[PDB]
């Protein structure tokens, strides 16, 4: 449903967030959380809609988002899950906050207008 300009903007933002530039604090957020492999077996007692950057990218690439608000919701869900599960002071929590700061900076430039 999304037009080309907004779609391209979102794909760019997500790929930048997954880019090597941010490797130092984005790596817990590229793929879906695996509770057992990470020794966090209670993960899905705290989180009910898992989300990750790779997932948002895949949904974008399949034209699954009608609009920037839906894409923004999934992306913010990444960080909301992060903070719901990782207590204050944990390394993953702090990486999540850092990644959200970068996301907000990039997103403030979002296309305000669409037109076909
Ligand atoms: C999001 C969240 O809420 N979690 C809950 C608590 C928690 N604890 C962790 C400890 C370690 C890791 C981890 O090692 N992730 C990791 C991912 C990818 C790679 N690579 C493979 C390919 O890409 C290049 C490198 C290396 C590592 C992740 C976590 C999480 C996730």
Residue numbers in the entry: 301 to 416
Relevant lines from the article:
The fungal Bromodomain and Extra‐Terminal (BET) protein Bdf1 is a potential antifungal target against invasive fungal infections. One attractive target is the fungal BET protein Bdf1, a global transcriptional regulator.
We adapted our HTRF assay to perform a high‐throughput (HT) screen of small molecule inhibitors selective for CgBdf1 BDs over human BET BDs. We repurchased and rescreened these compounds and subsequently tested the 12 most potent hits against CgBD1 and CgBD2 and the corresponding human Brd4 BDs. This revealed 4 non‐selective inhibitors active against all four BDs and 8 compounds selective for CgBD1. To better understand the different selectivities of these compounds, we determined BD co‐crystal structures for the non‐selective tetrahydropyridoindole 29 and the CgBD1‐selective methylpyrazole 63. The structure of 29 bound to CgBD2 shows that the compound's acetyl group forms direct and water‐mediated H bonds with Asn386 and Tyr343 in the BC and ZA loops, respectively, while the morpholinylphenyl moiety packs against Tyr327 in its gauche− conformation. Structural alignments reveal that the binding pockets of CgBD1 and of Brd4 BD1 and BD2 can all accommodate 29, explaining its poor selectivity.
